[PDB]
């Protein structure tokens, strides 16, 4: 067990040994040792090893040097190789139990070696985190309990590997190839939503999740992974991209591959890696429906840290893995791993799937306004820029780290030019037409889910001429992935006089009664404004995605935070709606604060102004920092999150 | 010592016992006990007590019931009264050592009882915090190490009490009256800056702090309190309001009185509690200098939690204590404690100093524009509102808690009307004149110390008429307390045409070359704008205080965070100036991470683009959460702060 403390697997080391490859582990008792892992072990396949109880050393692969011999006892040290395959091993010796071997971010020779402690702590050990959502212009951080070290998750991850397509075809090859984080990476990734029989989650995007758990409701990977195994490995209802990435992160972290979930705003996902996306809108600026895919408000994927021996030297580091399956050249599958640096450099020939990730982040959009006589005019749209605020949690702290710079060079820089050339993407001549006029959507201040509020189409005329235009404003609810719902606010002005060297601000009132019916749990509304000057026949387009704020969840920690001691969390919130909330339910969890997810229903409805308050009983079994993540659910106010860091010291 | 763990005084209990009143403490060995505290103890004065080693109990005051008698040993329990005076006590018994008694936030009967654990943890136990600075429109949180439990601070606080004016006049009364947190409160407060002989800090506000430590340089109370005692209790150079409040908070926390430092923006401090402040400006909007005090950009004071038996029932709770001496009716002294609820209610007759604090938060300002022929016109100024974002650190987390609601009822609410009536302050008829025109200062985006940037006078004409006005823009550096330095950007338009139903934005370029000479360490610049329409002869005034951002200090924690183990903190920053930095110096501290303040000078200058990086060696002796607070100093970039929460687990 003091191996746990040595291998950073302490929480995992309870009633079975679990260690990390490339590092020596204590064992206490001429004879020889033998290890076997797969269901068809073999010597050359690395899945089986025979080694003597020497006294010297001479590394190479597996060794078992002796250290002490306290008369009736015998202390020795087994050493696994830095590239030993991952999995369950059987340990037996000959005259004259089992351990689980994971990747080792701490071992210099391991392919997943992490140069610094804080990063190993964050990307492998810390079980709580954030998934960035909201909007490019108002980023929200959703708390999430990865809980990779929660009870039974490691066993589920091994089951997850042992049931993947490649293990079914040839269990022997699979177990052997599991020495490679890129190989394990592609498996973890494909098992999340792709591989439709044994897949972990079943995606659904239509806002109709009654017969399952809505994607926005999950507050951690643990419950998903459990519902999967406890129902014979059947897809859990339901997930969406951040959920896929989130459980993929949990699995990979459990297994020891440093991983972090990333969010990209204005993501050109599900376009066939196409770098020039065109939309055709009618005279009110409404995109003319069909087979065209909308830009996603945000899209999530994960990044895993490892070396890439299967590619040109120098591509070690972060590798982008997108477990959300997308339409590809020959089928619909997930993507990666591809080195992020390759994406930044425009090296699209690198495996795997470089052109897809490159597009998510660099695609170019053209908005056309179709008119009478089928004439088509290119509108100026300065509001849309693909690949916006690539975010992931900072190492060791709750602040958000912007990693956009790792995927892209500064706009219009020379290095950007190089990358775009290497990617056959020199399209960026910029129309710059500039009617001298500009326009953008302004919000003024934060709005809350449940309230009425004004937003504004803000026009700037930095010219000597006075224009007379028509301005078409339209606001409609949107799913996080682009699906537009019905209009929830419209306004047109047919004779807008824009004075010279001035600015005008036109308000658009958005009412709760108009957006309550179709707003998804992502709380997004998309405001659109089209300004057209009939003389020159110019079209100025501007759009913005608003995020309506949910009420905050107050969290009081009652009692002294000590290991193995009653802890009460009082959670509450105030109903923001002008009507009553029914079926209120608080849900809580967090690796380190409970082994079980806690739930508390509220029998009676919470009226319009009222607050709802309950107390959850916790029994924290671990010292150190842990995030208590909480979710609130009701009939008319869903998926409101909240969290609280709890320290918990010595008993 | 297990008393430490029982009395929440563990860090204090090393080589001398320290406990809290109103609660039993273990003691292990017909006889009777005796306790003496002052230098002139007495029975009725509560400073001396004689009590028998009973076997039953019968509380009342001091008791010494026996519990166990393991043959050669004897375990008993002394119990101090809930209102026992605070201090050093001598314990001796008769036939047939010493403890330090502090206030007890955990004891239901004590005057400082705190109803919940999280609040006791925050306001008494946590030794790290934030002091809000910056500007109403851009709040900055300065890290601060209170370190009330650092080695030797308790002894300094006792010295602090034993050398106060009231102890010099009659040591006997002083020691007795130290049973009252309000009494100890007034003492702690007065000793910080007021009482000029033995005062802790010497205030200075002229930006000339070469022969001492600048107020903005301090990163904790510890070093201040130490320099005080180690130089025979001589005022330390130099402090300002937040520093005074900060050390006052340290002392009060050490002593056990729950305390938190608060910041108020646009604070009408140092006006003689006057509720109607008037300024006379010339034709450019410049205030015409003299004896008039400027509104402070922000002002800080502390709040201590206690009951108020010396007043009408119901005034228990937070009490505002302002250790910054201000001009009063008869002399210049500090103020409070006054119940915050009394200030909210307008109950100005409550002791102590209610009308002063009431003014800080409620004063009304009138801006007059003097003209030719000595005619004076009242300008409309919607940009200034006194008492803005009363802030203090949240309990248990790093987020800022807005406590403005505790000092004031909503604007124009009925309760506000009541409070203003009880305070003879019904002045709020509102001019509402509204030329239909409005104006405010806009910033666009964050600017950094060291860069050039534009701000804007944003004019709104929601009228059918077209006006032709003159706009006078002026930007000047300012100290946090209102002291205007020389202008650093001006623009004067005499024929500004404002078109009907339009907005105009006029830029004012502020250059580093222009503000580098006089900017204070608070990084504040005050933009002013006066728009006058000559026809009706109307004056519109708008002002705003900008905060220039300092570069961030990156903090890497090298090694595993374990009790009693080498810990290396790598701190760095990137020079934001277009010129070189010389005399660079990093300073670090934090109760729980070092017993000593660490310093590291950088021999060579840091050039214009370059980064500076160094490593500090720490030896953390305590488990749990601790903030490592850091300060960077140099010739041309001063007082830049930074911090990092470090967890530190079992050895
Ligand atoms: N709730 C919410 N607040 C927003 C959103 N966008 C902006 N805000 C907030 O509204 C204020 C102004 O928005 P900002 O983007 O800074 O400027 P503006 O939109 O150009 O006026 C800021 O306090 C923002 O944090 C949004 O989508 N949702
Ligand atoms: N560094 C700095 N940033 C500021 C300051 N005031 C506002 N900002 C930031 O500038 C942006 C716009 O300012 P805001 O007050 O929201 O609106 P505006 O001033 O009316 O345009 C936001 O990102 C603010 O956080 C200031 O004094 N200093």
DSSP string, A604-632: S-B-SS-EEEEEEEE-----S-EEEEEEE
Strand, coil or helix: B501: coil
Q: What angle do CA B175, B180, B182 make, to 5 degrees?
A: 120
* Cβ–Cβ < 8 Å for B266, B295: yes
* Cβ–Cβ < 8 Å for B164, B195: yes
Nearest by CB to A397, from B396, B500, B645: name it. Answer: B645
H-only helix segments in A145-194: 153-162, 165-169, 171-177, 181-192
Pair of tokens at residue B158: 């006792």
Supply the DSSP symbol for B427: -
Reduce the secondary structure of A515-576 to three states and give it as a string. HCCCCCCCCEEEEEEEEEECCCCEEEEEEEEEECECCCCEEEEECCCECCCCEEEEEEEECC
Q: How far is the CA of A437 from the centre of ligand 1 (A)?
A: 22
> Which of B346, B364, B343 minimizes the C-alpha distance to B301?
B343
Supply the DSSP symbol for A124: I
Q: Do B558 and A499 touch (CB under 8 A)?
A: no
* Cβ–Cβ < 8 Å for B49, B41: no
* Cβ–Cβ < 8 Å for A325, A332: yes
- What is the spatial distance between Cα B83 and Cα B60, in angstroms, rounded to a whole number? 11
Nearest by CB to A502, from B396, B499, B649: name it. Answer: B499
- Find out whether the peptide bond into B337 is cis, omega within 30 degrees of 0: yes
- Residue nearest (by alpha carbon) to ligand 1 atom 22: A445
Strand, coil or helix: B178: coil
- Residue nearest (by alpha carbon) to ligand 2 atom 1: B446
B546 touches ligand 2 (CB under 6 Å): yes
Contacts of B556 in chain A (CB under 8 A): 116, 118
* Cβ–Cβ < 8 Å for A302, A247: no
The reply to whether A528 sits in an annotated binding site is no
Preceding-residue numbers of gaps in chain B (C–N over 2.5 Å): 29, 96
Q: Do B645 and A501 touch (CB under 8 A)?
A: no
- Residue nearest (by alpha carbon) to ligand 1 atom 11: A445
* Cβ–Cβ < 8 Å for A304, A395: no
- Continuous segment of H or E residues that includes residue B31: none
Q: Do B624 and A557 touch (CB under 8 A)?
A: no
> Which of A455, A457, A466 minimizes the C-alpha distance to A438?
A457
Strand, coil or helix: A324: strand
R_g (Cα) of chain B, nearest Å: 28
B137 touches ligand 2 (CB under 6 Å): yes
- What is the spatial distance between Cα A533 and Cα B13, in angstroms, rounded to a whole number? 78
End-to-end CA distance of chain B: 21
Nearest by CB to B624, from A558, A644, A649: name it. Answer: A649
- What is the spatial distance between Cα B557 and Cα B642, in angstroms, rounded to a whole number? 14
- Residue nearest (by alpha carbon) to ligand 1 atom 19: A442
Interface residue ranges in chain A relative to chain B, Cβ cutoff 8 Å: 116-118, 396-398, 499-505, 556-560, 623-625, 644-645, 647, 649-650
Residue of B nearest to A8 (CA): B560
> Which of A222, A243, A125 minimizes the C-alpha distance to A480?
A243
* Pocket residue to mutate for ligand 2, from B134, B137, B525, most atoms within 8 A of Cβ: B137
Pair of tokens at residue A223: 């419950």
Q: What is the residue whose two structure tokens read 């980023």? A: A139
* Backbone φ and ψ of B228, nearest 5°: -70, -55
Long-range contacts of B137-140 (CB under 8 A, 24+ apart): B137/B544, B137/B545, B138/B446, B138/B546, B138/B547, B139/B265, B139/B389, B139/B391, B139/B400, B140/B547
* Pocket residue to mutate for ligand 2, from B442, B443, B546, most atoms within 8 A of Cβ: B443
Pair of tokens at residue B154: 């308790």
Q: What is the position in ligand 2's atom list of the atom closest to the CA of B440?
A: 20
Q: A645 pairs with which residues across the strands?
A: A627
Q: How far is the CA of A138 from the centre of ligand 1 (A)?
A: 7
Known catalytic residues of B?
Answer: 241, 299, 322
Q: How far is the CA of B328 from the centre of ligand 1 (A)?
A: 44
* Cβ–Cβ < 8 Å for A63, A79: yes
- The number of the ligand nearest the C-alpha atom of A545 reads 1
B454 touches ligand 2 (CB under 6 Å): no
- What is the spatial distance between Cα B336 and Cα B204, in angstroms, rounded to a whole number? 22
* Cβ–Cβ < 8 Å for B152, B595: no
- Find out whether the peptide bond into B238 is cis, omega within 30 degrees of 0: yes
Q: Do A503 and B505 touch (CB under 8 A)?
A: yes
User: Which distant-in-sequence residues (6+ apart) come within 8 Å of B416 by Cβ?
Assistant: B408, B409, B410
Q: How far is the CA of A640 from the centre of ligand 1 (A)?
A: 20
Supply the DSSP symbol for A95: -
Q: How far is the CA of B547 from the centre of ligand 2 (A)?
A: 9
Q: B191 pairs with which residues across the strands?
A: none
Pair of tokens at residue B387: 């008492």
- Continuous segment of H or E residues that includes residue B227: helix B222-229
- What is the spatial distance between Cα B477 and Cα A651, in angstroms, rounded to a whole number? 54
- Is A7 marked active-site? no
Phi and psi based region of residue B363 (left: phi greater than 0; alpha: psi -120 to 50; beta: remaining):
beta
Q: What is the position in ligand 1's atom list of the atom closest to the CA of A440?
A: 20
Q: A535 pairs with which residues across the strands?
A: none
* Pocket residue to mutate for ligand 1, from A136, A265, A442, A443, most atoms within 8 A of Cβ: A443
Q: What is the residue whose two structure tokens read 């079914």? A: A168
Cα dist from B224 to A304, A346, B214, B215, B236, whole Å: 47, 56, 12, 11, 7
Strand, coil or helix: B215: helix
- What is the spatial distance between Cα A355 and Cα B522, in angstroms, rounded to a whole number? 49
Domains and CATH numbers, chain B: 1-111 (2.60.40.10), 112-434 (3.90.260.10), 435-551 (2.60.40.10), 552-649 (2.60.40.10)
Tell the burial category of A518 from Cβ atoms under 10 Å away from its Cβ (0-12, 13-18, 19+): middle
Helix axis angle, A153-162 to A181-192, nearest 10°: 90
Q: What is the position in ligand 2's atom list of the atom closest to the CA of B442?
A: 19
> Which of A144, A126, A249, A136 minimizes the C-alpha distance to A639?
A144
- What is the spatial distance between Cα A159 and Cα A136, in angstroms, rounded to a whole number? 38
Contacts of A439 in chain B (CB under 8 A): none
- Residue nearest (by alpha carbon) to ligand 1 atom 18: A442
Pair of tokens at residue B15: 């080589």
Q: Determination technique for this PDB entry? A: X-ray
Q: What angle do CA B567, B570, B576 make, to 5 degrees?
A: 160
Largest CA distance in chain A: 101
* Backbone φ and ψ of A216, nearest 5°: -70, -15
Q: What is the position in ligand 2's atom list of the atom closest to the CA of B447?
A: 1
* Backbone φ and ψ of A182, nearest 5°: -70, -35
- The number of the ligand nearest the C-alpha atom of A546 reads 1
> Which of A380, A331, A338 minimizes the C-alpha distance to A359?
A338
- Name the minimum distance, in Å, from the CA of B556 to any CA of chain A: 8
Strand, coil or helix: B248: helix
- Residue nearest (by alpha carbon) to ligand 1 atom 8: A446
Q: How far is the CA of A443 from the centre of ligand 1 (A)?
A: 5
- Continuous segment of H or E residues that includes residue B266: strand B259-267
- Catalytic residue (choose from A7, A8, A269, A299): A299
Pair of tokens at residue A119: 């990063």
* Cβ–Cβ < 8 Å for B561, B582: no
R_g (Cα) of chain A, nearest Å: 28
> Which of B461, B465, B513, B470 minimizes the C-alpha distance to B489?
B513
* Cβ–Cβ < 8 Å for B377, B359: no
At how many Å resolution was this determined? Answer: 2.8
Count contacts between A and B (CB, < 8 Å). 57
- The number of the ligand nearest the C-alpha atom of B545 reads 2
- What is the spatial distance between Cα B161 and Cα B155, in angstroms, rounded to a whole number? 10
- Other Cβ atoms less than 10 A from the Cβ of A327: the count is 14
Interface residue ranges in chain B relative to chain A, Cβ cutoff 8 Å: 116-118, 396-398, 499-505, 556-560, 623-625, 644-645, 647, 649-650
User: Which distant-in-sequence residues (6+ apart) come within 8 Å of B610 by Cβ?
Assistant: B574, B575
* Cβ–Cβ < 8 Å for A21, A102: yes
* Cβ–Cβ < 8 Å for A596, A581: no
- What is the spatial distance between Cα A50 and Cα A30, in angstroms, rounded to a whole number? 14
Strand, coil or helix: A80: coil
Q: What is the position in ligand 1's atom list of the atom closest to the CA of A441?
A: 19
> Which of A545, A462, A471, A559 minimizes the C-alpha distance to A507?
A471
User: Which distant-in-sequence residues (6+ apart) come within 8 Å of B460 by Cβ?
Assistant: B437, B438, B439, B503
B547 touches ligand 2 (CB under 6 Å): yes
Q: A461 pairs with which residues across the strands?
A: A437, A502
Pairing outcome for strands B201-203 and B236-239: parallel
Report CA dihedral (B12, B13, B16, B20) to the nearest 10 degrees. 80
Q: Do B556 and A504 touch (CB under 8 A)?
A: no
Report CA dihedral (B616, B619, B622, B625) to the nearest 10 degrees. 20
* Cβ–Cβ < 8 Å for A422, A348: yes
* Backbone φ and ψ of B118, nearest 5°: -55, -35
* Cβ–Cβ < 8 Å for B317, B341: yes
């Amino acid at each position: 067990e003091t191996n746990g403390r040595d291998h950073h697997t302490a929480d995992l080391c309870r009633e079975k040994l679990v260690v990390r490859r490339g590092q020596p582990f204590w064992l206490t008792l001429s004879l020889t040792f033998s290890v076997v892992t797969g269901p068809a072990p073999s010597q050359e396949a690395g899945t089986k090893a025979r080694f003597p109880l020497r006294d010297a050393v001479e590394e190479g692969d597996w060794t078992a040097t002796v250290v002490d011999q306290q008369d009736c006892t015998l202390s020795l040290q087994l050493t696994t190789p830095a590239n030993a395959p991952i999995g369950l091993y059987r340990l037996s010796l000959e005259a004259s139990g089992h351990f689980i071997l994971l990747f080792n971010a701490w071992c210099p020779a391991d392919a997943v070696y992490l140069d610094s402690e804080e990063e190993r702590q964050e990307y492998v050990l810390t079980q709580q985190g954030f998934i960035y959502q909201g909007s490019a212009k108002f980023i929200k951080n959703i708390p999430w309990n990865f809980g990779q070290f929660q009870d039974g998750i490691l066993d589920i991850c091994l089951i997850l590997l042992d049931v993947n397509p490649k293990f079914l075809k040839n269990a022997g090859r699979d177990c052997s190839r599991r020495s490679s984080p890129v190989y394990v990476g592609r498996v973890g990734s494909g098992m999340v939503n792709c591989n439709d029989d044994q897949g972990v989650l079943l995606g659904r995007w239509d806002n109709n999740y009654g017969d399952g758990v809505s994607p926005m409701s999950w507050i951690g990977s643990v419950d998903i992974l459990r519902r999967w195994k406890n129902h014979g490995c059947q897809r859990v209802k339901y997930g969406q991209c951040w959920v896929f990435a989130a459980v993929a992160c949990t699995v990979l972290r459990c297994l020891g591959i440093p991983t972090r979930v990333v969010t990209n705003y204005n993501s050109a996902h599900d376009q066939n890696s196409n770098l020039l996306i065109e939309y055709f809108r009618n005279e009110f600026g409404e995109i003319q429906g069909d087979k065209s895919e909308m830009i996603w408000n945000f899209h999530c994927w994960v990044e895993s840290w490892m070396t890439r021996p299967d590619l040109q030297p120098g591509y070690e580091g972060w590798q982008a893995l997108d477990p959300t399956p997308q339409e590809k050249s020959e089928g619909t599958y997930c993507c990666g791993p591809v080195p992020v640096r390759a994406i930044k450099e425009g090296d699209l020939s690198t495996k795997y799937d470089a052109p897809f990730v490159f597009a998510e982040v660099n695609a170019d959009v053209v908005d056309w306004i179709q008119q009478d006589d089928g004439s088509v005019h290119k509108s100026i749209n300065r509001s849309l820029i693909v690949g916006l605020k690539i975010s992931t949690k900072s190492v060791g702290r709750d602040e958000r780290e912007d990693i956009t710079h790792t995927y892209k060079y500064p706009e219009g820089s020379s290095e950007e030019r190089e990358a775009f050339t290497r990617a056959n993407h020199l399209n960026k001549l910029a129309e710059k037409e500039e009617t001298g006029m500009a326009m953008r959507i302004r919000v003024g201040q934060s709005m809350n889910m449940g309230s009425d509020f004004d937003v504004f189409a803000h026009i700037t005329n930095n010219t000597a001429e006075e224009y007379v235009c028509r301005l078409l404003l339209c606001a409609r609810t949107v799913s996080y992935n682009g699906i537009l719902g019905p209009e929830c606010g419209t306004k047109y002005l047919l004779n807008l006089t824009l004075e010279p060297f001035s600015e005008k601000s036109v308000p658009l009132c958005i009412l709760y009664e108009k957006y309550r019916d179709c707003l998804t749990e992502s709380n997004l509304i998309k405001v659109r404004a089209l300004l057209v000057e009939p003389v020159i026949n110019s079209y100025l387009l501007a759009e913005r995605d608003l995020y309506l704020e949910n009420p905050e969840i107050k969290i009081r920690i009652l009692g002294e935070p000590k290991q193995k001691r009653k802890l009460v969390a009082e959670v509450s919130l105030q109903n923001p709606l002008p009507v009553a909330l029914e079926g209120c339910t608080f849900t809580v969890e967090g690796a380190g604060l409970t082994e079980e997810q806690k739930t508390v229903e509220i029998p009676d409805p919470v009226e319009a102004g009222e607050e709802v308050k309950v107390r959850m009983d916790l029994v924290p079994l671990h010292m150190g920092l842990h995030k208590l993540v909480v979710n609130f659910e009701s009939d008319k106010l869903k998926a409101v999150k909240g969290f609280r860091n709890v320290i918990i010291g010595p008993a």
